[PDB]
């Protein structure tokens, strides 16, 4: 909406420091390390290419507002999350014990902090069982 458009303009200005309406991979990297994380030049390239649609090496505002407006539903992440949890499901039972998440979530890839995994179990342990089912869990993520 109009207010969302204004917020997206604020975000674009925060990113597009030059104010040319196209986010530079260097601008993105600078803001990223301002947030406290260093990417790789190739990593930023893949990110932008993922969001890029005009094949220009930058993002015009239409693409940016599309990216903000793209809710996870149109992304269709159901099958991907199902498959990932299945990969981490060593039993095939359709569930997974809490300790396995506490370990892997915090020791693989972009390791997550204690608070994040705590809210993870909070929203996943709706039944308070610990042996959370990943299938229903991705369903609840979707909704």
């Amino acid at each position: 909406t109009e207010e969302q458009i204004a917020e997206f303009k604020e975000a674009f200005s925060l990113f597009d420091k030059d104010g040319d309406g196209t986010i530079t991979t260097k601008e993105l990297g600078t803001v990223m390390r301002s947030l406290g994380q260093n990417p790789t030049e190739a990593e930023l390239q893949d990110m932008i290419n993922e969001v890029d649609a005009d094949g220009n090496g930058t993002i015009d505002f239409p693409e940016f507002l599309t990216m903000m407006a793209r809710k996870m539903k149109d992304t269709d992440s159901e099958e991907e999350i199902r498959e990932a949890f299945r990969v981490f499901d060593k039993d095939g039972n359709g569930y997974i014990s809490a300790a396995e998440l506490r370990h892997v979530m915090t020791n693989l890839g972009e390791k997550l902090t204690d608070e994040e995994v705590d809210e993870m179990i909070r929203e996943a342990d709706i039944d308070g069982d610990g042996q959370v089912n990943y299938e229903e869990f991705v369903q609840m993520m979707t909704a």
Binding site: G36, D46, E80, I81, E110, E115, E116, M141
Partner: protein
């Protein structure tokens, strides 16, 4: 400086331990140096060339021993990088490993010999060459292949051993007196082994026509069964390498699964409208208008992670696709069961509204 010192310690430990790129070339070069030292030892054993061979061998061996000493020193020192071993105590504990024991006894034996010597020097060359592997990967692969195909190898060995014994004994009976090659059963057995292997030195061979005929009929089968194990092992090597590649593929899948789950949770936990999400925003704040930017970067990370994980779900095998699709087919079965129940409800209502 100190942080750079730790970074270089970790880099050196990685290079000396299982390397990936240029450290591979460094290991190739050290192996080549040891190989050239062995070649110069070979030439030294030659008489007419002994002079220059030994002259170059002494200096090449001094280079080899200094390289070995410094490499072991650096390996021990960098052993502190890993969380398992840290400090001087940790480095000593790492040195307690049997492989480091092999290396250190080799080092001391070489230094003692340098500061009947040919026997010890050649031995030490052989042990260091053995040590080159550094991981037992070749040995582990060979042992795994032998164990996996234990039955084929055992039957081949049994049949070939019977063929060897029988052929040698029959030829010995046939060629006991007429031919001086087979004066004893031990000679006949040596001939049998040298023939069935197809080495055929020619120092022993049947000459009596009955002996020649028996040898022909038996060495046909003998050479077949002595060649068997080589082919069995080749096939087993291929199979085991394929299986190891499959496992590596599945671990390369395992890590991006965690990456995607992490990023998806963070993005789902960075929704602007949704409340109670500060448990996630605080992480980025600790890393550090800004809220929308945080959401944008988080969703960007989630999308890139999704693309990478999806690319990580390559088939790689019929089994893999069949398994994934069978899981999906189980979901499909559940959905059709739910729709069966819903139509059951509708047909049950039918009476109510009719």
């Amino acid at each position: 400086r100190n942080a750079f010192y730790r970074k270089l310690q970790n880099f050196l430990y990685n290079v000396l331990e299982r390397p990936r790129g240029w450290a591979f070339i460094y290991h190739a070069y050290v192996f080549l140096l040891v190989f050239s030292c062995l070649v110069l030892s070979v030439f030294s054993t030659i008489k007419e060339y002994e002079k220059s061979s030994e002259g170059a061998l002494y200096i090449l061996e001094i280079v080899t021993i200094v390289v070995f000493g410094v490499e072991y020193f650096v390996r021990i020192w960098a052993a502190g990088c890993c969380c398992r071993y840290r400090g001087w105590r940790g480095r000593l504990k790492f040195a307690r490993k049997p492989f480091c024991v092999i290396d250190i006894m080799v080092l001391i034996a070489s230094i003692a010999v340098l500061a009947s010597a040919l026997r010890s020097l050649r031995f030490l060359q052989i042990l260091r060459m053995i040590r080159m592997d550094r991981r037992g990967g070749t040995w582990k692969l060979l042992g795994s292949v032998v164990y996996a195909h234990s039955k084929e190898l055992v039957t081949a060995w049994y049949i070939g051993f019977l063929c060897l014994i029988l052929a040698s004994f029959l030829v010995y009976l046939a060629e006991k007196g007429e031919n001086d090659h087979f004066d004893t059963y031990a000679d006949a057995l040596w001939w049998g082994l040298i023939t069935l292997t197809t080495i055929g030195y020619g120092d022993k061979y049947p000459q009596t026509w009955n002996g020649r005929l028996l040898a022909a009929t038996f060495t046909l089968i003998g050479v077949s069964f002595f060649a068997l194990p080589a082919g069995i092992l080749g096939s087993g090597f291929a199979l085991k390498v394929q299986e190891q590649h499959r496992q590596k593929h599945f671990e390369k899948r395992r890590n991006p699964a965690a990456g995607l789950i992490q990023s998806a949770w963070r993005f789902y936990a960075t929704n602007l409208s949704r409340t109670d999400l500060h448990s996630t925003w605080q992480y980025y704040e600790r890393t550090v208008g800004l809220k929308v930017s945080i959401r944008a970067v988080c969703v960007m990370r989630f999308l890139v992670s999704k693309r990478k994980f999806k690319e990580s779900l390559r088939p790689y095998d019929v089994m893999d696709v069949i398994e994934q699709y069978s899981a999906g087919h189980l979901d499909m079965l559940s959905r059709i069961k739910s729709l069966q129940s819903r139509v059951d409800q509708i047909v049950g209502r039918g009476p109510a509204i009719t």
